[PDB]
Structures are given as structure tokens and as C-alpha cells.
Amino acid sequence: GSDLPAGWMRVQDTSGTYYWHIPTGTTQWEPPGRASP
């Protein structure tokens, strides 16, 4: 790692890992998607 572009983190939930873009508040289930990783 890391396969995430700057600004993104993984977040743990019981239902799975999601992706959070801190600067914009964006959350999604698909790996980003910015980037550049």
C-alpha cells in the first residue's frame, strides 16, 4: 500500500469497507477513483 489517492481513506463498517474523501465529504463503496492513486 497505498492504492488510494491523497485525500481518501478506508473506513471500517460491519457491512464492509467504504471509501471516504475527507476534503469533500464524499463516501462510496467503490475504490477511488480520483486520483492519482
Partner: peptide, 9 residues
Amino acid sequence: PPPPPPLPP
């Protein structure tokens, strides 16, 4: 962090 997002359609 914010809550888990909904599943897309």
C-alpha cells in the same frame, strides 16, 4: 467518519 453510504442502484 461519516456513516456508511447507501448502495447504489
